[PDB]
Symmetry: C3
Subunit: 555 residues, 3 copies
Amino acid sequence: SWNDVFQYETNKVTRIQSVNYGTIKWILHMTVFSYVSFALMSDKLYQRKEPLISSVHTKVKGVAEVTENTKLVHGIFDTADYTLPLQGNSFFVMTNYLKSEGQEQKLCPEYPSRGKQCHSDQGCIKGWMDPQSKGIQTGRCIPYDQKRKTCEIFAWCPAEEGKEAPRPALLRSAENFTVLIKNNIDFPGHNYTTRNILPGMNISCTFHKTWNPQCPIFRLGDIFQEIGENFTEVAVQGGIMGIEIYWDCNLDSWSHRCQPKYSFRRLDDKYTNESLFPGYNFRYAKYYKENGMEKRTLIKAFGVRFDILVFGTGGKFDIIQLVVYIGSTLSYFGLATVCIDLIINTYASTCCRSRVYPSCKCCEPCAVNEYYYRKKCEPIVEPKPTLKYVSFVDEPHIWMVDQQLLGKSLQDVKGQEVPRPQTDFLELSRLDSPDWCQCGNCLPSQLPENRRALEELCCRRKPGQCITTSELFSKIVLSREALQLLLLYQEPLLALEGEAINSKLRHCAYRSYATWRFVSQDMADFAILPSCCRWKIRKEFPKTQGQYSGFKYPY
Amino acid sequence: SWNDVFQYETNKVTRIQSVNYGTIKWILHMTVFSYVSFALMSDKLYQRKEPLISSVHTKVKGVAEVTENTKLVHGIFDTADYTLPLQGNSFFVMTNYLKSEGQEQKLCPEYPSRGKQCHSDQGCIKGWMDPQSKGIQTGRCIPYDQKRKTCEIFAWCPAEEGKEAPRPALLRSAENFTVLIKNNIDFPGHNYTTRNILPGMNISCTFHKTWNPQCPIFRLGDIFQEIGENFTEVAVQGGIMGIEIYWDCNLDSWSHRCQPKYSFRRLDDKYTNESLFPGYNFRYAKYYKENGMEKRTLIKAFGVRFDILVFGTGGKFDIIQLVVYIGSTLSYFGLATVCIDLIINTYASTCCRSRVYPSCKCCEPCAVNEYYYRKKCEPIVEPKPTLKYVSFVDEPHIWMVDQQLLGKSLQDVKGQEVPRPQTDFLELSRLDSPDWCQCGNCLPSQLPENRRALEELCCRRKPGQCITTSELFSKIVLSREALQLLLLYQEPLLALEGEAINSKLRHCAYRSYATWRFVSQDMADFAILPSCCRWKIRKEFPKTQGQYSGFKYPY
Amino acid sequence: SWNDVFQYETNKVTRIQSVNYGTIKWILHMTVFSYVSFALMSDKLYQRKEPLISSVHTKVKGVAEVTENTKLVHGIFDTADYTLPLQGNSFFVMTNYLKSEGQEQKLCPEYPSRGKQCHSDQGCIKGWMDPQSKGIQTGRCIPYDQKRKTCEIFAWCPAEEGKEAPRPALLRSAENFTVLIKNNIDFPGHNYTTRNILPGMNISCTFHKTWNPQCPIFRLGDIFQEIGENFTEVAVQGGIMGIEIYWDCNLDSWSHRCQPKYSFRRLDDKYTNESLFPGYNFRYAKYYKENGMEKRTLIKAFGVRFDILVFGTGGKFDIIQLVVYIGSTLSYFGLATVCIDLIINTYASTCCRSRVYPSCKCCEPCAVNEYYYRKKCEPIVEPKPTLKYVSFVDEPHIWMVDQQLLGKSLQDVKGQEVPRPQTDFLELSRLDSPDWCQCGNCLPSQLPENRRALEELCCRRKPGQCITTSELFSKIVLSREALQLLLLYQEPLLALEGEAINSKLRHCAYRSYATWRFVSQDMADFAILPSCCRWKIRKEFPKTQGQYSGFKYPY
Ligand SMILES: Nc1nc2c(ncn2[C@@H]2O[C@H](COP(=O)(O)OP(=O)(O)O)[C@@H](O)[C@H]2O)c(=O)[nH]1
Ligand SMILES: Nc1nc2c(ncn2[C@@H]2O[C@H](COP(=O)(O)OP(=O)(O)O)[C@@H](O)[C@H]2O)c(=O)[nH]1
Ligand SMILES: Nc1nc2c(ncn2[C@@H]2O[C@H](COP(=O)(O)OP(=O)(O)O)[C@@H](O)[C@H]2O)c(=O)[nH]1
Ligand SMILES: CN1C(=O)CC[C@H]1C(=O)NCc1cccc(C(F)(F)F)c1Cl
Ligand SMILES: CN1C(=O)CC[C@H]1C(=O)NCc1cccc(C(F)(F)F)c1Cl
Ligand SMILES: CN1C(=O)CC[C@H]1C(=O)NCc1cccc(C(F)(F)F)c1Cl
Ligand SMILES: *[C@@H]1O[C@H](CO)[C@@H](O)[C@H](O)[C@H]1NC(C)=O
Ligand SMILES: *[C@@H]1O[C@H](CO)[C@@H](O)[C@H](O)[C@H]1NC(C)=O
Ligand SMILES: *[C@@H]1O[C@H](CO)[C@@H](O)[C@H](O)[C@H]1NC(C)=O
Ligand SMILES: *[C@@H]1O[C@H](CO)[C@@H](O)[C@H](O)[C@H]1NC(C)=O
Ligand SMILES: *[C@@H]1O[C@H](CO)[C@@H](O)[C@H](O)[C@H]1NC(C)=O
Ligand SMILES: *[C@@H]1O[C@H](CO)[C@@H](O)[C@H](O)[C@H]1NC(C)=O
Ligand code: NA
Ligand SMILES: [Zn+2]
Ligand SMILES: [Zn+2]
Ligand SMILES: [Zn+2]
Ligand SMILES: [Zn+2]
Ligand SMILES: [Zn+2]
Ligand SMILES: [Zn+2]
């Protein structure tokens, strides 16, 4: 009970003083260790990594001049005139505009854009809502001008929807505008927070990839040129540009590095279909009361929407992550054992000696793997009731008959051949007949016919002299003195009298013959004695008034 | 030194030619492999997965008609009249509105909403700021109309806060409005970028779950109906609807699949308490100068705020992730070994033979596990100074006394029984008395009394003939020729003279008796000779002028 | 073929009935299990964790009074007067403002801010765009007032850019404003969704860290005070405050817990340089038509932008994650085996007996590890052609010469010493001369001179009596009867006639001598017989008309 808990099992091992195998094992161990360490260090798998939460504050600086008309109108544009109040992750800068002043909710012809003309009142629908014209049709075609006529619509009039964006863009000088971006990032799980601007930074700096990669002041034209985009062309219809701020932050004290990396990427497709609203624009309405009427000035503003995308992760050493990674990678250190054991098993096979070695003599010295295999593995078979081992004096090996005997004599059955183990030279360094019989000394079995084929076995497969004729048979098997000595060794105070001693001697003779002709006790316990030897043993130690049971299954 | 590095250790193994165990091992191996592969493939654990960074551009199309009043006013609503300039992840569409025109900062009665009436000036507070009424009270109750009176407040007047949203919603036609959503997603780590619109897409399409799941043009009424929401009812007070875009993107070349999946989800609670601002609405102010006074038109706009939620991950094959997963799952392949070893150990126990097997004869053939266990494990015990082994000729087994002898004779002590190993039949296949004594040949020990109980041992536990009477005792133990032969085998040129040869012969006799009666050298080295045999051996090889040391601890 | 699949290999093990080792093994197993379970439970490594998608709806309540001027103007501020229409993840509350009314696009002096004065027309540039002044210079210095003069610029006039924010802040009462935040979070992968407000919540509550941590109604002054921020001071120039909502949500049914945690964090740097736009402010333009001219009222609004940051993860039990973690941590259970095997190997070394044990007698009882090591490991060496084993009767050990013999006699070579294994006492418990010769019975080798040093070996290293003189040599080696008995044991029907029997007897004598003097068959197969014994054996069984081949490499 208590002693059961107080046990430790250690595997039995064979150590081989081999230069090749030791070198291979150490090389594989070092390779596995190097790869594991490189991965752990390269991927920071010892670090628990967290995503950041970001806040962005943008400030746009720049002044623009316009001289556009029917009178020549001079106009000044400041931040309040081309920027919306929003100053977060996205900010919009106007680069072009179409103005429709003094709009009133009434009837008017629709602008003739992209084949919008009509040639009859019936052609244009009545009550149809046209998002393109932004008005409700009255079913009449009215003259937009002298030459072309367009359908009447109830809408904000005059209606200029469909008018092409002015070219060149009016606010081209927006390329010279600057934007200051303040980014505050926090890793809430790591209890860390930082910002893209730190004390001691130059305030007159402008961002550059190489000279000033940390300056958070960006020129829009420089942003466009950094990625091969033409600000002048994009200004006509507008677009979307993304300013990516990447935070590859290491929060370990010994390797602390939390710096932003700035990049730019056009976010709107350059080749958008004309029907899918290419570019970026929106309509801005200014409502005012004139006299006693409500009027609207509509601005179709085209510009570049700057999306500030902030992403990244913060890594900090975690014991659990390192433990998990080490546990995952531990099993890879058995690669050396697996490979060397596979080599030993493969080179132990006889196939390589018969075929591979004669063809290639370089792989000859690896025949030593047979010795390693025989010192490493001990093959055994299932001890089932049908297991039987037979040895013939003429033949040098043993046969394993594990099949049921369905009347056919055991001699006739073939079985499968197995080798004879060496008989422990260390301990050995001391001083008419039945049809199936081929020795002339066998007799028919006295067992029931249903189980008689077991004892229908001869000492040899071909005619010749019986094994009993050898003097060793009498010395080992029939020598009463030797069997008595063995029994006394097992039972020092044994009583050498009665039929019990005869039965003990018969069993000892059976065991002696089995050990002599089969060597291993595993095979001896399942061996089958030949009829000649069995009956000679019984004739030396006859049973008075009983019937012989014969071989019995140990299990 | 150098040879120490050049070593390889391989485990000693026993292979069993068993159909059941091999089948179980292969079945378990295949099960583990199948589950591991299914997980790896199902969860793409070989892929490093990254979150996307998204940009959204929305374009709303639609025109609305209103005919509302005291004169009947006809009104046209376009995108600039019901959409805010923002066009990013969220866009708002107006569905209803309450208008208060020509507001001036002055005194006025507060709107009588939800029991806001007063019956006395003292009842209403003075200087109290009421966010519900949005004004500062003057402490007076003034007549809002003929029948009801409300407290005076300084505020934008006339004040209509508390007025119920018009029913039915004025801008019901907003259900017919359409929205085009352009989504650009990037996996910065995988250096990949894509968009929800690709060349060759239909431009007249409208989104449908089955017919057109990839059309990025959505009808708001269709959005509401897809999830069983009534646009007409929600339009009265407004709400929030989320358009989820999911990107389950695989970036492997052989399995490249990066497509958006569109879904809809109401984000505002349908059953919000009346005091928690049900629905979605906000107040929009238009300031204008009339004559020489600043006036404000307040619009309480109720509508649906459409939140475009973009989420997803991009997976790309990574060697490190696959290696980590394989290392994690490698240890699961030892399940077959664990289970089969457990079966062997459990079925080797004697308990099953005495109890389980007689009750159930189906589990009988599994008695072979005893052979496997005896061929697999070699039990040993700690060789401590108190370890002692005693054998009695009458008894068939050996006793292990590992307890200290506190004066009690070793014969009296019981110990614990252990079996006798087989005596290597292969090598064996050759040619008055003290109170505790039960054989009549033992003598009292000559050791100091403090350690005399060790030698107070007899050859048997019950009266009878001494083991010395057996001839094997003289042949093995007292045979001078045999001991000399053994010594010469160990020392070929040994000098057979002097008392040294006598001591060598005595030690050899002790060893011979221990091996004969204990077999295993592990037990023999810790065996204890009976007093009778010990003193007979000493009488055959007496020590001239010395005192016998007795048993000595090997370690 | 089929039987190859039907095999199972089980490791051979030695179990040790040791209290110390069993206790250590169980303690280490329990430690590993406890740590693994604690990690799994603490880190919820059995849970697949997902990030949330969030929607935020904000409602600000509050009314503010202002009495500011040249006439004293009384002003009322409501939500529409200090909040923008946006009500999502960020909302802005105005706390101070600078008003410039009736602006017109024309020429005017620039505001004299921070040394903006000029003393000459030439000093100021012409056509230079100044984002600070927000105007285009005309190259003239004009009198801003009686005492100071500033450069003329085309811009919105009058220009007040550079004017300091009023102190104290006009909208200080904003500290008393309240904000209601509704947060809807969804874990799309876990198919879960929840909100920060649930039925039964108090509607008159205000948020507090301890009393009401779940109230989603926050007072701005309370927000600032919770983290030691002064709302009154920040109101002058503005700032950014982040309201963090953390969702540590467990979606397991038995441990369901999805509740928000509210926190506050200032997001704008308190010590920003004066040139980097300290605080938070933006310019808001109101355009109106007066008479027939377009005029603009500019509001420089300073305030606090409240960024609502929502983050968190939802964890739900996943079988794959648990399986992966268990597989990763399984290999850690071999720590007990590794440590105990290391202890056994280290304490088996002889070094500790000679040096460590005499110095420290407490580590003496651990000498038992030698027995465990000898019962655990079986050292073997590579059987290479150069492997040779030599034994000298005078010496008690064996020498392994694995080096090539380059003419030097094998006797002269030293080799390396190795111990002699015990000769299986169980099986043993039965009945002039050449210059290099030191026994007088050796003879020169008859082999070719290129391979003659192999047989140039004597039975001893020093002069003395030859091993052949011992009677055991004749009994074991030269005894024809014993060799015949061995051969009959191997070949029962062997023919004892001809020269074949002589060769068999010579080989058996060689084997007998090798086994006697080397014991282990591994060393015996590579042993080298002394010239004296070799030639005595050959003289007993001479070869008639042949030349002796000598030692042959088994592999
Ligand atoms: N291996 C083996 N054992 C045998 C054989 N014959 C008998 N035995 C053993 O001897 C015992 C039966 O002895 P036997 O003289 O045949 O019958 P008994 O006189 O009734 O005891 C059984 O336990 C068998 O295991 C045989 O041919 N081979
Ligand atoms: N196993 C065992 N060994 C013994 C016993 N008695 C003596 N020995 C061994 O014999 C040696 C002592 O021999 P002994 O004749 O008793 O004393 P000595 O004459 O001084 O050598 C010691 O090394 C013991 O290990 C015994 O009862 N059992
Ligand atoms: N271990 C060992 N084996 C030897 C030695 N000499 C001969 N043999 C073995 O005996 C066989 C050769 O016998 P030998 O009488 O020398 O030559 P043969 O008469 O032609 O057979 C070879 O297979 C050797 O393995 C020796 O010194 N040591
Ligand atoms: C064409 N303009 C004039 O003649 C006078 C100035 C200009 C105009 O009306 N500015 C209004 C305004 C204010 C903020 C943001 C925007 C945005 F849409 F660009 F983002 C806009 Cl348009
Ligand atoms: C009631 N109305 C009229 O009589 C004339 C048109 C309409 C009105 O005033 N539009 C102002 C406006 C412009 C953009 C966005 C919005 C939003 F709040 F809905 F988002 C709004 Cl209200
Ligand atoms: C100074 N004021 C007056 O004299 C009359 C009221 C006030 C004013 O003009 N409100 C305009 C307005 C409307 C919404 C949001 C904002 C924001 F910028 F603060 F966000 C603003 Cl400024
Ligand atoms: C930007 O500024 C430079 C230098 O003042 C000027 O040469 C250039 O014309 C400007 N760009 C535009 C579009 O006006
Ligand atoms: C950029 O676009 C403008 C107008 O579209 C054009 O005049 C100019 O040549 C373009 N520049 C480049 C480098 O393409
Ligand atoms: C939407 O359009 C259809 C077809 O023109 C029309 O029948 C329906 O009344 C419209 N919905 C509303 C709310 O006007
Ligand atoms: C939707 O709401 C409107 C007005 O609230 C109602 O008339 C109509 O019957 C509702 N439809 C459904 C399907 O509930
Ligand atoms: C906030 O309200 C309290 C109580 O009404 C008042 O004492 C305090 O002065 C108010 N704060 C400001 C800045 O007016
Ligand atoms: C907060 O700031 C105001 C004005 O800047 C000042 O009067 C007051 O003393 C400050 N309070 C604290 C606690 O610092
Ligand atoms: Na493992
Ligand atoms: Zn026969
Ligand atoms: Zn025969
Ligand atoms: Zn006795
Ligand atoms: Zn006795
Ligand atoms: Zn010699
Ligand atoms: Zn010699």
